[model samples]
Target: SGFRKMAFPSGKVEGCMVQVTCGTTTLNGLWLDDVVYCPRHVICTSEDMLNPNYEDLLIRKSNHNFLVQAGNVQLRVIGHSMQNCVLKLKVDTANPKTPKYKFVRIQPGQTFSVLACYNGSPSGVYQCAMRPNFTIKGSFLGSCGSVGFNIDYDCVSFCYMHHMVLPTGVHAGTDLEGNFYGPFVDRQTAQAAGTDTTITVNVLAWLYAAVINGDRWFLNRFTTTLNDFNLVAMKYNYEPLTQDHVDILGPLSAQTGIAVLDMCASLKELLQNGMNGRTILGSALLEDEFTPFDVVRQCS
Candidate 1:
């Protein structure tokens, strides 16, 4: 009802997975999870199984192509030694299924590829929503601590983002309108060039709306005095803050904290225009934030 999801053509679907890193000894992901090192495979995670550095896998949405497609990977766990380790496979039917297939343990190891909702043969996926309708999680059992992954033809939800390498990796956000905003760089660079424009009143409304009254910092920044007496509207409405007066943005923004407000007609206009709308937006993050390739903006 809010935002649209990306779709693949009939009979065509892209597999998505948890981007994993190196194995200290052998690098066979599926094999290690299914055979000899079944009880102690650490290829997909750290040896200690505590620190996982997995990233997202998506190319059209990301700058780099995936190292390996998600289809090549599947669940890994096997052997009678499973008694020593603890593990469980819970299938999340977020979108609900029409129905079919049994979920009994199928021997030393098991694979999700055998499920019936899918017409084709594979570990990729089927019957998913815009984001992954299916997700899987696992336990250390003994070696690998725990693992979780999202599975779908298009695993990302509300994908519209890009990495800005100005310093570390700034979050370059955009609305459904494709209007870009935020990332901490706006205040310093907004007045410099057309590329870096003013933060929209829409964002200002969003900022104010998001700030709870209990949030002293943001509330004070929007309506505080130069000396900080707790009231009287120093930042909100002074002669210069009104529509008629003109003050240099540097000092105004420095005092007000938000440069965008000082140059505007009034907080009312900012509120009215900003009150219009703000839509589905996203930004870049690696590892814990997300898998790398999933950050994509849909076209057509």
Candidate 2:
């Protein structure tokens, strides 16, 4: 199926409260794909909709805008603010100063698409930015609220890249709230031990990053793959499995030296621990069959 994009305006300059629904059931914040300004404010008149009265919810804002465009390869922008803005799309190449495509004078509540190419291919990494003028008087800056987005080819995959991956120790011992406790420490001060703990901490850090950032697609893929691996293990009575299953377990086991079953169990424990606790697994699933190390590393 083709990509689908929708906007929900919050009726405020800051944006609006959002709710995702599958049939009659309302989903969690983690399921929110992207937030864009809607043509009109969403109103909830009755209790059945559980709309939260719209006005009472906390205001949310985004520097990044999401939209859909045709062709197997394209870049899109949707203006979700009250002020006029400019959207620029730049491909990663030798020249850093020039943008491959630019949409000038995009009014509020408008959309634009550009057929983009990178590295001589239909697909490549592209960086996008939206520059909104400062509405306040006496502002020296030309554009005050500028937001940037990275559109990698992998974004076409069900799981798109989200945030930049920091050095292993750099992100260690940090919570989803961006609070840092201390550097990641190892039970043993040896190199191998520190490396193992760093890897584990990094894994947890990436997981927490996803939850905090609300990358629902990444989280959904992660949990689905974990569930599949666990189901297959249960069916085989936890005995040695086939090559397919072994392949599934390869990267995960290589990273932590923990078996697939044990890793899955640890993930569940981490999720139950919640954001307030140490581990950062969300209330949902998030990834691809392979470990997310490469994807996480390249994100920015």
Candidate 3:
């Protein structure tokens, strides 16, 4: 079944030939061990010969996409001059059948390349094993150093990410609602210029968001400052009705797409009207730091 026995320089040694045995069972003319003896003869070891710590398998999880480096592993084998010692690769840890995780056969002269596969799970471990079998002249033998590999997974366990080159003027922001926000502010302004304004919108706001949090860095003379925070403009207050404010309101409402908050009375009235129309009333910011201080006013 397993390693049986072996004897060096078979056929008549000294006075008595070497008698190899495994648990009282004599394996003289069996496939216990096989090695090239001479021109046409061969030598063999008992199938019961056991080699310890000859095979090793290590598994590790990948943290980042670009850094998939693992530690060095070792494998050793001892035999009677064999050839074509294949190192088979596989994935499935449970079944040891014909199909493999992946297989790469190696011979006596060359080393095997690092075998890998896209193990995309966050917390699953990788397992591998080595099957050492070699050929002696025309006969074959099951060699030592059959080891199993088990790797513990780690690194990126929460979220998977991809590197993206945000367009020159795009930014990620945090809205007052704590939603991760982003938009093309510079593009918006350039498109809004009804006249064919040839000027670039300076991309200052977008750059500020991207560079401040280390999402990007300042290049050339486009420097960033402490005060270069997110845009805090609010909808122009349209209540307490001023002609100038209303005039601004038309564009501001169009820009912000919401009715501006003015006074408590106007806010109450708007809420009442909205409730009457069965409109889901979102909370209006009575005191929000994100709202511009200059735009807030009390209705007369």
Candidate 4:
């Protein structure tokens, strides 16, 4: 019954005439005095035009107290707050939409460990975030902030490493088994202190590994830096490479054309020949010969 139509007042037939049709029925209206005209009517419902208001949701930063520690492909979150809450851990935050989230219940003064899956890379930088899961008045809150750490695939996949800065401004590295190694100050100091005798050999092994992995950036810097080469030799107590060795290593400097490639080839050759700590040092000396135990080692 909700129908409507337009009406026209009678006037001149040419200007005020109307026609109507219903199925097979047809009707015509002429412009006559005291006559009314109407068109078809249309129907609609009230629901066709309606609007609604939705409430807004809010997310707040967490205020929970927690500490984070980095490990090999793993992280630890320690909660220090007196309240119990859910701990939200994000292992990789590089992609916001696809971050891996792990939830654990952390009680007051409790620690939770989050182990990360293998990312299929030998080395990488990963970001992590920790937060407390709590809701107050329909609002989510609590964050432990975010931080980044470096992962050494070798350390995790092979063995753990302990890295330390030495008194001589050298970086001393050791495996979990307590085998000492370093790119020490010089062969003399290392020998005098009776430190690990395989430091130089280990350094070469590191270089060899980098080259094998096609780490061009590290290889380039290693070959081009004179100080770095010297440190490698000095680590085995062979300071001031012999004049002959220095001459050979000089061409490997950054100033030389194709130095990185040349150096990598040379190192590969030396390593292939089963060169040991002493022989490698001997070949670099002007004398072209030296005693391993007498010059740099007090004991085997």
> Number of the top candidate by TM-score?
2
Predicted candidate 3 versus true structure: per-residue lDDT over 1-300, tens digit per residue: 111011112111111111212122221110111211110001112231222111221112111111111112111112222122211121112121111121222221111111111111111121111111111111111111111111112211110011111233221111111121122121112211111111011112112222223332122322222122111111222212223333433433343333322222233333234334232112222221111111211100
Model 3's alpha-carbon lDDT is: 0.19
Model 3 residue 24 CA deviation (Å) reads 99
lDDT of 3 at 127: 19
TM-score of 1: 0.20
Name the best candidate (by lDDT).
2
Where in model 1 is the C-alpha error above 4 Å? Answer: 1-16, 20-157, 161-194, 207-300
Report the lDDT of model 3 for residue 291: 13
Local distance difference test, per candidate?
0.22, 0.25, 0.19, 0.24
Q: Which model is ahead, 2 or 3, in terms of TM-score?
A: 2
Clashes of each: 5, 11, 14, 7
For model 4, the run of ten residues with the poorest summed lDDT: 135-144
In model 4, state the lDDT of residue 233. 48
Measured on C-alpha atoms, candidate 2 has an lDDT of: 0.25
Worst 10 residues of 1 by lDDT: 283-292
Q: Candidate 4 lDDT, tens digit per residue, 1-300?
A: 111111111111122122222233222211112221211110001231122111110012122211122222222222111111111222221221222222122211111111111111112122111111110011111101111111222221111121222343333222222233222221122322233222232233233333333433322233425455455445434333333433433322323344433464454344344344433221332221112211221111
Cα-based lDDT at residue 273, candidate 3:
41
- Ranked by TM-score, the better of candidates 2 and 4 is 2
Error of 3 at 259 (Å): 7.2
